[PDB]
Structure formats: structure tokens, C-alpha cells
Design a protein around this ligand. Structure first.
Ligand SMILES: *[C@@H]1O[C@H](CO)[C@@H](O)[C@H](O)[C@H]1NC(C)=O
Ligand SMILES: *[C@@H]1O[C@H](CO)[C@@H](O)[C@H](O)[C@H]1NC(C)=O
Ligand SMILES: *[C@@H]1O[C@H](CO)[C@@H](O)[C@H](O)[C@H]1NC(C)=O
Ligand SMILES: *[C@@H]1O[C@H](CO)[C@@H](O)[C@H](O)[C@H]1NC(C)=O
Ligand SMILES: *[C@@H]1O[C@H](CO)[C@@H](O)[C@H](O)[C@H]1NC(C)=O
Lengths: 597, 194
């Protein structure tokens, strides 16, 4: 009779529809992902189009239900997520224009290739050619050539394309009462209708700028140390006060800095911790690695993998008979089917990635009870955080010795722990300025705060002021160098990595403080402490049926992203860098240039 | 003197879907529940009121064996004092229950790749069922106020929905065949015991 009970009935039908159709779609996509042929492409695309058409039809049919007439916040959340038609609101010609430009950009990036002026027939896709070029080649000129070439080939192409895409997407967002597409993305953290837990979309920007302000010292000292080491590596190229040239960042753009580790390790005579040899010398294979990670997760009281995972998933590469694109992924096919797709090479890095993906699988196993629309993260950042914390808690030397996989008498010292923390801070602390800078630039673009013919002029500005990056070649407005990236060109939200990083250390510190660990935070391990297990499960079992702030306080007792756990975890490293930096200027000038000298 | 026909009912090859739960009457025979109890094949065996041993040497007037197929998780809902789709719309157990509940995994037959769509369940109803009442109707559901007159559409819903049984489902979603027994005592002689 009322609106509430009728929306109840409607959603109760929509669940038992979307579950079946999503199973068909995801299972077809899986069959394609393990066995790459044409008929699999056919089945996958047909099932996916059927599912998407069902979703669009159901959104349209659902918009007939009045939202504000709803009190029970579960029903309100499901109705809000469903009724958001999105791109389905534009004129059909405009919709086809969107799909057109999206496919052009995605394919251009996915097939673009480059080669030197000497052999126009011997040339490479980025992966793995330019990838390894930026990752391992130490030739300055070679890396600068790679930099400018990839920034020129896809950049000039997508530049006006990205202009048009920005226009059309601003229109798409404004259609549904979203001031722009940036705000549309930020609308994932938005929470309303809950006292003491509301969260506005601009509050997100405020929080992010805040947290970055407090992280700034650690990153600044890290950048000082790394600049000093690279000057010791490439003295004829770097200024003792100037910013770091991007083409030396161990990657084409510097999403991570991992590849600088060997180039900047302090104690270059210390034997690094690696159980690869210890693994192979005991006949360790896929089944063993994954059984060990599963035993880990049973140690903290979380439930263990149901037999379906062991039977169906693909743990070992399917030989040379059939091919698969095995980027390591975890799949929740719905209805109680969980799988992992991974070509596990028996190493240490893979022994960590297995824990990460199995953590994704645990998080998905946790909320199989919530209705369909809520089977997801509480925000766009909890999944990868719940994944990462397990890897960093199981990569500790103590845990490694606990399973006998390490010589029990390996002695921990200041040198090895500074090396470990430097590895970490190069992986994690290095990517936060990049993530924040890029997301802020994209937000400012979408808010119209920048004339189009000025985009690039502003872009490398913020890096020069945030990530300590300086371009070795003057780039004009015809390039769209950001587009040369995966997520920029493929239109993905990018701040989920920042939120992942910070929620990661909040979770880690809270969990350790729940295990009564005494000592530095990094050497902490959560194993055998069912207290931390239940503390984390009480956040896992929710899904998104609650505001993310509530599930965050259910664990860390705070109501907002907070850097203090990060600085706590990295304190010893920060002290060591403070010692080492007494002989180097911390910071950078904004006028020094590599091309206008 | 003749044995009760627990064979033809317990492991025949095609069970009836839940909303049309197949009922069978047992009388005028001798029953041996011992093979049932010590079968150790059923991954769920629970009941309320009698001991699994003592029931062998007890005499009852009439016995009823209901049988159907359901999902994994929902097997718990077959118990006096539960609520949910199977206990609300599809099946009812009275709190003064007297029989037993037997449930065994059925991912063997009842599922097949591509989805086995021969098993259905009632998804909506105007009111909850009474004990031991079976409704087979399929009149479109009046979700709104405007009558439908037999058409699918806004606020007009189909009251049956199909279990998408497949072989690659988790333990909670692989099918589960279920047999529920009840006894009753009346004035007439108790023709059912052994
Ligand atoms: C891969 O796909 C082909 C095409 O349908 C099929 O013939 C083959 O059996 C598949 N591989 C396996 C291992 O089933
Ligand atoms: C909201 O609906 C759910 C079922 O969809 C129900 O379990 C819950 O109790 C409802 N909330 C309130 C406050 O009644
Ligand atoms: C999970 O752990 C429990 C611990 O009691 C064990 O009984 C169960 O067999 C384990 N699961 C599997 C699939 O082995
Ligand atoms: C966890 O406990 C088990 C059994 O008590 C023990 O064998 C193992 O070494 C412990 N591991 C850690 C990291 O405490
Ligand atoms: C019927 O056969 C199945 C399969 O072997 C078995 O599990 C079940 O116990 C049998 N029925 C009886 C009454 O033993």
C-alpha cells in the first residue's frame, strides 16, 4: 500500500533477477579469461550485453519509485544506487558519441607503439618494451627518448579527444544533478541521512588535502634521500636543489618507485631477505603456497576456503596448450562461487600476491549475506586495503621464520629493518603524492577551473609543487601526457588508491593494538591472535549496508581518514632519514629546468 | 507385515519443486528407520520430539513424507519456529512438529552446466502460509493498487521464480533434497510400526 513495502517487493524481485544474470555474465567472462578463443568472446559479449541491457531496463523501471518517500536506509541505499541512470540519460546520438570516443581512446592506448628513427619496422608496445626500458635501462638518453616519445605519440592524439570527452561527461553528470563528473566520482564517499556520520562530497576534498599536508614531511625527506642517491648515480644531470626529472623514476610515469630500490639501498652489502631459494629448495609449488596462505587466514579465526575454490580456480598456468591473460585477479562469481586466476611463479613476490588476492577473496566471502546491491566494498578503497594489510602482515621476518621457510637464526638488526622500511616507503609513500596530484588535477579540470589551452601548463605545475617532479622536455598544449596513463585514458577513479593507502595503516595499527604487540609497528604480525580476526570480521561482514565511517570506527575508533598510523609505522625510517639528510637540502626550487638552462 | 515403501520415495530420480512439495502417505506397513539413521549419507539430519532409536519400536496411525528440493543456506529454515522465503511463502512447519528432517546434497544430479531451470519457488504472496498448506497458483502479484488482469509490468509481478541451479555453486547454493516426516495418532488402530 505504501511506497516502502512496494519498493521492498521490487528490490526483492530485482535481487533474484540480477544474481542469475550476473552469474551468467561473470562465468562467461571467466571462461573467456582462462581460454582465449573466439567463441568465448562471443558468449562473453552476448551475456554481458544481456546483463547490461537488463540493468538499464531495471534502472528505468525503478525510477518510478519516489526516493524521499523511503525511511529504512537499506532500501534507500539500494534504490539510490539502482535509480541512478547515469549515461543512459543523454540523447542517443550523444551516447554513441561517448562510446565512440571511449573506444577510440582505449584502443589507441592499448595498441599504440613506438620505435627509434633507425628501424621503422622494429618497434614495441609499451608492455613490455617501454616497460622494461624505463624499468631497468640506466642510459639517461635512452630513458629521456622513451619519455618524450610515449608522451608525444598518444598524448597529441587523445588531447582533443579528451577535451571532447570532458565536455560530454560534464554534460552527463550535470544531467543527473551532479555539478560535474569529479563530483560524480566523489559521490561514492557521500553519506547522508545518518546523524553523527554524515559526509559531504567537498568534505572529502578537505580531508584529502588535510591528510596530504601532514604526510608532506615524510615524503619530502624520502625525496631528499632519493635525490641524493640519484645524484650519486647520475651527477651530470640533477641539481642539488632542483626537482627530480621524471624519466629516472623507475617507470614511465612514477606510479611506484620500487625500481629505485637497488639503485638507492643504503646497506648495499647486506644480503636482502628473500625466501625464493628457501622456497624452491623445499619443493614449494602453487598448491603449497596457497595452502599456506589459507592456513594463515585460518590462524586469525577467519573462515577457510570452501572446496569450490580448490576445485574450480586456476592456480597453475595451463601449460602451452591453451592461453590466458593471467593478471592475478580474484573473482566472486556470486551465489557462493569464489575463484582466483593467477600464473603463480614460485617466488617471494608471488607468495605475497597470493596472500593479497586471498584477502580479497576473504573480504568477498565475508558479506555474502547482504543483499545484492550491497555486495561490494563500503567504499572504493576497502577491498584493496583489506588485501594489502594481509600481505604486509605476512611479509614480516618473524612470520617467515614461523613457518620454517627462513633460517631460524637470521638476526634482525638496524640495517635490515631500514632496508625493509625503505622498500616499503618506496612502494607506498612514493605513490601518495602522485595519486593525490593526479586526482586533484583531474578534479580541477572537471570543475572548469582551467582553460583548456592551459591544461598542460597547469599540470606539470602541480608536480613541480607536489611530487618534486620536473619535466626534461618542454611539453606544449598539444600533448595530453596524463592520457598516456592507463586510468586517465580508460576513465577510472584514481583516489581510491589514496584512501586504500591510509585505511591500510589505520587498519594495521588498530589490528596490532588488538593483538597486544609490543615493539615497532612494522615487525608486527597478526597471526594466532583471534582478537584482531574478530575485530576485522566485524567490519568485513557489513559490506556497504552502513556508512563507511561507521564501519571504519567499528575498527579504528575514528570517523575519518587519518595519517597518524602511517607516520607511526614509518617512524624509525623517518628518524634515520632525518639523520642522513643533515648533509642535503630538503625541498626543491620551482624555477630550475632541465631544458631551459 | 509388508515393508514400508521408503525406497521409492527416498531416492527416486526426480523430486518435486518446493512450491509443489510432493506429499506421500504411509500406512499399512512395517517401517525400519535404522538404515535411515545409520546411512551417514545425509549431510543434515535433525528432528524434534522422538529419539531416533525409540521411534523404531513405536506404533502410529498414519505417517506423511513430504519431499522437495531447496537451496543450501535455506535448509535451516525447515524447522519449527523459523521464518523466511521457504518458511513464509513456500512451506510451513507447525511448532508442534512430530516427524524428522533429512537433507542431503544434490549437486550430483539436479544441477547441470548452463543452469537447471526445472526447479521453482514462490517468491511473493499476499499472506503467509498456514501449517501444511500448499498453494500452486500463479496469478500475477498485485504489487501496486491498480489491478493487472494477468500482465507483467510495473507493480505487477510473477509469483514463481526459478532456482538457477548450476554445478559450480558453493555449498550454500548447490541444491539440497529434503524429506520431512510427520506422524499422527488418532482413535483408529496404529497400523504403522515395526
Ligand atoms: C578452450 O576452448 C575451445 C573452444 O571452445 C574448446 O574446444 C576447448 O576444449 C577449451 N579448453 C578446455 C581445456 O576445455
Ligand atoms: C529494513 O529492511 C530490512 C529488510 O530489507 C529489515 O531487516 C530491517 O529490519 C529494516 N529496518 C528497520 C529499521 O526495520
Ligand atoms: C576449516 O577449518 C575447520 C576448523 O575446525 C575444519 O573443520 C574444516 O574442515 C576446514 N575447512 C576445510 C574445507 O577443510
Ligand atoms: C601460531 O601458532 C601455532 C600453534 O600454536 C604455531 O605452530 C605457530 O608457530 C604460531 N605462529 C606464530 C606466527 O605465532
Ligand atoms: C538412496 O540412495 C542414495 C545414494 O546412494 C543414498 O544416499 C540414500 O541413503 C538411499 N536411500 C536410503 C533410504 O538408504
Amino acid at each position: 500500500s505504501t511506497i516502502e513495502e512496494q519498493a521492498k517487493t521490487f528490490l526483492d524481485k530485482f535481487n533474484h533477477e540480477a544474481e542469475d544474470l550476473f552469474y551468467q555474465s561473470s562465468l562467461a567472462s571467466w571462461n573467456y579469461n582462462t581460454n582465449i578463443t573466439e567463441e568465448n568472446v562471443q558468449n562473453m559479449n552476448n551475456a554481458g550485453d544481456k546483463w547490461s541491457a537488463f540493468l538499464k531496463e531495471q534502472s528505468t523501471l525503478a525510477q518510478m519509485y519516489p526516493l524521499q518517500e523511503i525511511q529504512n536506509l537499506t532500501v534507500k541505499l539500494q534504490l539510490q544506487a539502482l535509480q541512478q541512470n547515469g549515461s543512459s540519460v543523454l540523447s542517443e546520438d550523444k551516447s554513441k558519441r561517448l562510446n565512440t570516443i571511449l573506444n577510440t581512446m582505449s584502443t589507441i592506448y592499448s595498441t599504440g607503439k613506438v620505435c627509434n628513427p633507425d628501424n621503422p619496422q622494429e618497434c614495441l608496445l609499451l608492455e613490455p618494451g617501454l616497460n622494461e626500458i624505463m624499468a631497468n635501462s640506466l642510459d639517461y638518453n635512452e630513458r629521456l627518448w622513451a619519455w618524450e616519445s610515449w608522451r608525444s605519440e598518444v598524448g597529441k592524439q587523445l588531447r582533443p579527444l579528451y577535451e571532447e570527452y570532458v565536455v560530454l561527461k560534464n554534460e552527463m553528470a550535470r544531467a543527473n544533478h551532479y555539478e560535474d563528473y569529479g563530483d560524480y566520482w566523489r559521490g561514492d564517499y557521500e553519506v547522508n541521512g545518518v546523524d553523527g556520520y554524515d559526509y559531504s562530497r567537498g568534505q572529502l576534498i578537505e580531508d584529502v588535502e588535510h591528510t596530504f599536508e601532514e604526510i608532506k614531511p615524510l615524503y619530502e625527506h624520502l625525496h631528499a634521500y632519493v635525490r641524493a642517491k640519484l645524484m650519486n648515480a647520475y651527477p651530470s644531470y640533477i641539481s642539488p636543489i632542483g626537482c627530480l626529472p621524471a624519466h629516472l623514476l623507475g617507470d614511465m610515469w612514477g606510479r611506484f618507485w620500487t625500481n629505485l630500490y637497488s639503485l638507492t639501498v643504503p646497506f648495499g652489502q647486506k644480503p636482502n631477505i628473500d625466501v625464493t631459494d628457501a622456497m624452491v629448495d623445499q619443493a614449494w609449488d602453487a598448491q603449497r603456497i596457497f595452502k599456506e596462505a589459507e592456513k594463515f587466514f585460518v590462524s586469525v579465526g577467519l573462515p577457510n576456503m570452501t572446496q569450490g575454490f580448490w576445485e574450480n580456480s586456476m592456480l597453475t598456468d595451463p601449460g602451452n596448450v591453451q592461453k590466458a591473460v593471467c593478471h592475478p585477479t580474484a573473482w566472486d562469481l556470486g551465489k557462493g562461487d569464489f575463484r582466483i586466476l593467477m600464473c603463480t611463479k614460485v617466488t617471494m613476490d608471488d607468495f605475497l600476491t597470493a596472500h593479497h588476492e586471498m584477502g580479497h577473496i576473504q573480504y568477498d566471502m565475508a558479506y555474502a549475506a547482504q543483499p545484492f546491491l550491497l555486495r561490494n566494498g563500503a567504499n572504493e578503497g576497502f577491498h584493496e586495503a583489506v588485501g594489502e594489510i594481509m600481505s604486509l602482515s605476512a611479509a614480516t621476518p618473524k612470520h617467515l621464520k614461523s613457518i620454517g621457510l627462513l633460517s631460524p637464526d637470521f638476526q634482525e638488526d638496524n640495517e635490515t629493518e631500514i632496508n625493509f622500511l625503505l622498500k616499503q616507503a618506496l612502494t607506498i609513500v612514493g605513490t601518495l603524492p602522485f595519486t593525490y596530484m593526479l586526482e586533484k588535477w583531474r578534479w580541477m579540470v572537471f570543475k572548469g577551473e582551467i582553460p583548456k589551452d592551459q591544461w598542460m601548463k597547469k599540470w606539470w605545475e602541480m608536480k613541480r609543487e607536489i611530487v618534486g617532479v620536473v619535466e626534461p622536455v618542454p611539453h606544449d598544449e598539444t600533448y595530453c601526457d596524463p592520457a598516456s596513463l592507463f586510468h586517465v585514458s580508460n576513465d577510472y577513479s584514481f583516489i581510491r588508491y589514496y584512501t586504500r593507502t591510509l585505511y591500510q595503516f589505520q587498519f594495521q595499527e588498530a589490528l596490532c593494538q588488538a593483538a597486544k604487540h609490543e615493539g615497532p609497528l612494522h615487525k608486527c604480525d597478526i597471526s594466532n591472535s583471534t582478537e584482531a580476526g574478530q575485530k576485522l570480521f566485524n567490519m568485513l561482514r557489513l559490506g556497504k549496508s552502513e556508512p563507511w565511517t561507521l564501519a571504519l570506527e567499528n575498527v579504528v575508533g575514528a570517523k575519518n581518514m587519518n595519517v597518524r598510523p602511517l607516520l607511526n609505522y614509518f617512524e624509525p625510517l623517518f628518524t634515520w632519514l632525518k639523520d642522513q639528510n643533515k648533509n642535503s637540502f630538503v625541498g626543491w626550487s620551482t624555477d630550475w629546468s632541465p631544458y631551459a638552462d | 507385515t509388508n515393508l514400508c515403501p521408503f525406497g521409492e520415495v527416498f531416492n527416486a530420480t526426480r523430486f518435486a519443486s518446493v512450491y509443489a512439495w510432493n506429499r506421500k502417505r504411509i500406512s499399512n506397513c512395517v517401517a525400519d528407520y535404522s538404515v535411515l539413521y545409520n546411512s551417514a549419507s545425509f549431510s543434515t539430519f535433525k528432528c524434534y520430539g522422538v529419539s531416533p532409536t525409540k521411534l523404531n519400536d513405536l506404533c502410529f496411525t498414519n505417517v506423511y513424507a513430504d519431499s522437495f528440493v531447496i537451496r543450501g543456506d535455506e535448509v535451516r529454515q525447515i524447522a519449527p519456529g523459523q521464518t523466511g522465503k521457504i518458511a513464509d511463502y513456500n512451506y510451513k512447519l507447525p511448532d508442534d512438529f512430530t516427524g524428522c528432517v533429512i537433507a542431503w546434497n544434490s549437486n550430483n544430479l539436479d544441477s547441470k552446466v548452463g543452469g537447471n531451470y526445472n526447479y521453482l519457488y514462490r517468491l511473493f504472496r499476499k499472506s503467509n502460509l498456514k501449517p501444511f498448506e500448499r498453494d500452486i497458483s500463479t496469478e500475477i502479484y498485485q504489487a501496486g493498487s491498480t489491478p493487472c488482469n494477468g500482465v507483467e509490468g510495473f507493480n505487477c509481478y510473477f509469483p514463481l521464480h526459478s532456482y538457477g541451479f548450476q554445478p559450480t555453486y558453493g555449498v550454500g547454493y548447490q541444491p539440497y533434497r529434503v524429506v520431512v516426516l510427520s506422524f499422527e495418532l488418532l482413535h483408529a488402530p496404529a497400523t504403522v510400526c515395526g
